[PDB]
Amino acid sequence: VSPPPPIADEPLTVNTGIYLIQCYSLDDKAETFKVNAFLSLSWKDRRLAFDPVRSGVRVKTYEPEAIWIPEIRFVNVENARDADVVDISVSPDGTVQYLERFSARVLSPLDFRRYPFDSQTLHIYLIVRSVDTRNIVLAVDLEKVGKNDDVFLTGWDIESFTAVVKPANFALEDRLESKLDYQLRISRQYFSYIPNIILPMLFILFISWTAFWSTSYEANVTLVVSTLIAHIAFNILVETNLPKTPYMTYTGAIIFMIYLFYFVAVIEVTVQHYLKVESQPARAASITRASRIAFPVVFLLANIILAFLFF
Amino acid sequence: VSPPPPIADEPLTVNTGIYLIQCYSLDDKAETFKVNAFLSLSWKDRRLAFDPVRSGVRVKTYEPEAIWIPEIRFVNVENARDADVVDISVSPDGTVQYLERFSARVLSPLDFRRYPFDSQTLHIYLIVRSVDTRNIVLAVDLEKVGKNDDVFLTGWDIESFTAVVKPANFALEDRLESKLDYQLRISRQYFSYIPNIILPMLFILFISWTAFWSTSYEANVTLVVSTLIAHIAFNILVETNLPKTPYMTYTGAIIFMIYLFYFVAVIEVTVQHYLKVESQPARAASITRASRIAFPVVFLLANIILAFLFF
Amino acid sequence: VSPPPPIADEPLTVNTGIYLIQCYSLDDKAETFKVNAFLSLSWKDRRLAFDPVRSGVRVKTYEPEAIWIPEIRFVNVENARDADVVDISVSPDGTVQYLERFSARVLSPLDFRRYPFDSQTLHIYLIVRSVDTRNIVLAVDLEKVGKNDDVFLTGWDIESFTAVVKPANFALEDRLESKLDYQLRISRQYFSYIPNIILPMLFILFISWTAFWSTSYEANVTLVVSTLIAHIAFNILVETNLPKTPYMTYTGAIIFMIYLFYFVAVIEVTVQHYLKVESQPARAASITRASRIAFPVVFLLANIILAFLFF
Amino acid sequence: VSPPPPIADEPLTVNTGIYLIQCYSLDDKAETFKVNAFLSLSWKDRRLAFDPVRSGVRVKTYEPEAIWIPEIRFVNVENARDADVVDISVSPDGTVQYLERFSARVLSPLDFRRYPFDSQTLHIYLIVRSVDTRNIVLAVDLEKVGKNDDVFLTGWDIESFTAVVKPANFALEDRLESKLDYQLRISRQYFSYIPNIILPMLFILFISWTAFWSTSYEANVTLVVSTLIAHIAFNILVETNLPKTPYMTYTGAIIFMIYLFYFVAVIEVTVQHYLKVESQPARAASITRASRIAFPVVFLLANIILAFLFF
Amino acid sequence: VSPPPPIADEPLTVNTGIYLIQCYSLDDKAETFKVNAFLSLSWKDRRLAFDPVRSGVRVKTYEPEAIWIPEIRFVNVENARDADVVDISVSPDGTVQYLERFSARVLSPLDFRRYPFDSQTLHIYLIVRSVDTRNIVLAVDLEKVGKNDDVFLTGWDIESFTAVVKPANFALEDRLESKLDYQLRISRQYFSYIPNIILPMLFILFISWTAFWSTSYEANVTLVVSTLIAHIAFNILVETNLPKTPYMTYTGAIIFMIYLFYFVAVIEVTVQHYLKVESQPARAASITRASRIAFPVVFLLANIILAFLFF
Ligand SMILES: [Cl-]
Ligand SMILES: [Cl-]
Ligand SMILES: [Cl-]
Ligand SMILES: [Cl-]
Ligand SMILES: [Cl-]
Ligand SMILES: [Cl-]
Ligand SMILES: [Cl-]
Ligand code: NA
Ligand code: NA
Ligand code: NA
Ligand code: NA
Ligand code: NA
Ligand code: NA
């Protein structure tokens, strides 16, 4: 079967629509998400047109094999979509109304700069390759674009699901291609990060600073070194839930900066001890007393600077 | 093949039934479960009706290809169900009796607020899309809804398997849809959590409190800091077996609260030492003596408050 | 194609046999095992019968499509078995001899009460659903039930592979079902658990007890607390290799009990120190001296009691 | 299609050959490896024979469906091989030349006794089941057995790929079976184990022995206990990369033995301290001085004994 | 269908082209990458040639089944590529223009010697096996070789995608094979390794060196032993993200060398203490004072030597 012939030299407009049934498995490391949705296609094939009076029927239902159906593919899927045709309905004027239910693992890049307070725009790219007979152009029927109410993405808030109505028409392998951008805007549920990572990480840091109220070198070494190891554990836990970015993430920046606080705390703990042994505890006392104010102030200001830079 | 024609302007009622053969793999993080069950469908196709006297047979057996079968799909499955038709039996009045055996990975949300003492309602949503010829409505044949005795879900107690008999009829893409709710009520087997997480977590906390019966700052620092690290390990162990919730879980609340106990224990240990060095051990003794009663009392009351809030 | 017609009102007896080719991947957490075996089926279809003299051939080979084959399914498989028909041989009395090679992930529950010294009975349930024409009953041809010599299950000893010859005939959805039980008896290779978990776990415990020969509170705190953390690591390592049971496992019981030994050791270490500071080292000496005998004796007796209760 | 008829009462000899294209994913825990290779089959079917003069062609190319092809299966694959027929060429005498390209996950047991200095013999078992018409026997055409130069197995050295030319002919289910053994000899690349596990493990042990040059019980307790925990971490790291063997592995033996060294070091550290408190430091000095020589000597001799026993 | 017949004794030239649509999942441990691309094939079949005047059409579109298509396979894929034919267009002279969209998991070895500052050349090997009728030779149509702009490989920089235009023609199983090399040059995004592994690893090492400004053996033991354990954790974290190489990697070399620094620091800490107890603190002071300069200088020079050797 060949494509529908043109009235003039116009291209064939295939009206599209994606209706999300299920949404799930957003893999941060892999930068992928799984989707289960309705795909709707509609185009005019004058060859399939009929008189409702003569035929008796108001619409004709065809099996996929029987008629010409445009080869609609997804640009950013890992493997070809697992589709099952729901219905094909031809109107008297030849307006075909195709509907399929698909499932696919979509590969869409993620921006982790403000993690875990980040928001993302997941993409679904519909594409059609023009045939030698005639050029095929994609369109968005906004009435067939949407999502089910029940849809939820674990640990994410689904903001919107819209389509960029004007297609990206370009040449590839000397043939026209019509690309459509379906955008699923989501924003991370940062809540859990606060009692699981942020607050425990701050508690261990504050525990390290109790060495500014101790003259016992042995106790201080234990305090600063132990807490530093707990901070390593938190850093490792965090980097496992994320991919390797060629940029600094918000949480990444905080965690890294905290290493410098542990480093300088060790230096202070060392200096205080050296001076005490050197029989200069008056100078050591001045340094320790200052550190009690310096460490939280410099920590608080550095964090304001980071939050400012990142948001 | 087209759908059965109506007697009047009535919709076609497809009677359904799910009989669970096997149940397994409830993924808490992914909020999914795998099912292996019987699907039964029954509708009246007057076109397939026959006289038992003339034909000789009491029922006629057809191959799926031969007759019209309603396109029944599952709303919340990840990928299309892996089904194999067991039997299709037509009665003389045209009452078709379809049976298939399926397996699917069902996506049903879980409520972790009372974890690990939580109970869940897993869902299986049957759906049918109405055709242009006529509207299709789902029904529950309670005689064909059930589960095998042997069925067990690892680490869960299967309470019930029922169906919400009245379907959720709605419009989607200008077409009628009939949705049915099959509910599998389950409740978690919290036993193992007690000797593996809860009791070990309490033991390390109680060990930290022995610093209230020690004047040795160095020993106290070791006691409170070490146990705190074991508590971090338990927190990390727990959060790996669970997804990121935008709410606090029962175990999550307990674990978080325990961090504050370690923090205040460090403050006490620090205060006691500062005072001792300051040549005020009488004041330090008062604080330590109070802490011996204060720490378990405030812990016990805080837990009563939490259990009350959560249950 | 319809089933073979009966001579009298007898049911159709389908003789079965499973011959294990490969055995592997027993998942303790998932309570599943993968199998790769021969499936043999044999039934009498009088309609396929022929004259050897007239036809020339002694047996006729048919393609699965050509003749009626009973719908034999496995009850406890996750997804439908991946089968490939090896041969179908019809004798001229109409005795069909079907053989297929399959592979499946079988879901069979495991009893961890005596882990790692446990033994299991893995099951393979053959099932047939009776048709409206006539009832189908399963049988075991003991000559076609067995396993290859090479077969081995990693970390397990394969004891036997037998079939419960009398089928479980019952009604389900107003139709007769014939269920057969193929049992693969296995017993765990507990060897590795001794030098990897049991002995290292005992060594750290015995190390903690050296605090009964030390008056240094600071050293004792280090000894008991450190070893307790190593015991947490061993407990966590063990629980990862196992599913959450609503009962206590043998290793689980030992590990849990050991926590109480660490708890009481801390109490002793604390008591001894308090008394020493209180200028009562004579009483502290009595307690420490007793503990040296009490701790191993109570440990040894408690273990005898556990081993007795568990075996 | 039936098998080729025999000239006399001889069996049909199917000449085989495996040419490895790609080799990869040797899973030590699962005892499996993935293969991507050429399968070649050649047998004489006199029914397909032709005169080159009359026909014009020197060889005839057939589609798999058109002619009889022997049912060649792999014994030790997990699931049936993913094969794609490359070519089928019939010579004038009826000598069929079949070639397919396959990929399979082969299950072959591994001997970890000398790990990580072990060598293995991976197996690929070709099998054919004889038909009721005539018996089928496998043969090795050594000219069609080999491997690509590029082939490499990550972390392994590929020694050889040969076939045991004489098949294992036996009865199974009253039918003849011809089994062939394709052996892929490999030897582990033990290099990485030296700077990652062996040397770090020895360093921590030697660090523990510095307690023989210290009279500080508190420091010694820290030295021996800390290093012992690092040794636990190494033992756990090792056992994760390996399956549970009912025998001792070389690395397993070394690691286990090292636990005894830590145990005895604790005993020494304890004894030395007890004696010092008991105001007998002369006796404690003798024990400590001996331990300085005893510990490395006994360690070195024990290792010679192990290496001897294992190799 | 047989291959196109030759004009003279020339081989059939199949012009190829790969256009990368999506690139992803480069597994360092498995040494694999997933690809989603366009495959284009073009050859001359004179049998399909036609007069544009007589036929009316300028090009003819065929279904894969209808005409002869060369059996093009990938050498280094794990399993056979998942391909879907996009278009087949025949020109009047018989120049066939085939296009398919594929997805495959390509196995290409990686060189980790300069990790994480390494660069790689991923390969895609196109291969064709010559038929008995005539020899088939591959060619590169440079106009149909490329990649989409959007293409990105997570944690990698895509440098180029070119093809080695002259094929590797060789004999295999007495038949000609034409192999083509498609090279995807990539270079690692080493950024993240600096704040996550390199700098934290240096910080803990520098913390260990504060023991050169402390006379407290107990504090020094804590400093050097604790930091050494954090270094073990970093070594383990690194080796999990990498496969077992029979060579030293850059990061591997640094990490290994750092163990020697911890070992010698322990020796210094031990020596200093022994001398102090031996009432020789003047000699111990000389050693400690030297170590303060020696340790960073020898560390810095050793690193220059390593960087030099590795780059
Ligand atoms: Cl697609
Ligand atoms: Cl479905
Ligand atoms: Cl509505
Ligand atoms: Cl409607
Ligand atoms: Cl099955
Ligand atoms: Cl096979
Ligand atoms: Cl391929
Ligand atoms: Na079509
Ligand atoms: Na149908
Ligand atoms: Na059949
Ligand atoms: Na065939
Ligand atoms: Na310490
Ligand atoms: Na073809």
Residue numbers in the entry:
A (entry chain E), B (entry chain A), C (entry chain B), D (entry chain C), E (entry chain D): 5 to 315
The authors write:
At present, the best structurally characterized pLGIC is the G. violaceus ligand-gated ion channel (GLIC), of prokaryotic origin. Each subunit consists of an extracellular domain (ECD), predominantly in a β-sandwich fold, and a transmembrane domain (TMD) composed of four helices, labeled M1–M4. However, the GLIC is a pH-gated channel, activated by lowering the pH, with a maximal activation at pH 4 and a pH50 around 5. We instead found that proton activation is a complex multiple loci mechanism, with the key contribution stemming from the coupling interface between the extracellular and transmembrane domain, with E35 acting as a key proton-sensing residue.
In contrast to the nonsignificant individual mutations, E26, which is found interacting with the bottom of the β4-β5 loop of the principal (+) face, shows a robust decrease of the pH50 when mutated to both Q and A. A combination of E26Q with mutations of vestibular-facing residues that tend to decrease the pH50 produces an obvious decrease in pH50. The key mutants at E26, D86, and D88 were solved at pH 4, each showing a structure similar to that of the Wt. All structures were in the apparently open conformation. E26 indeed results in a loss-of-function effect, whereas E177 seems to have no effect.
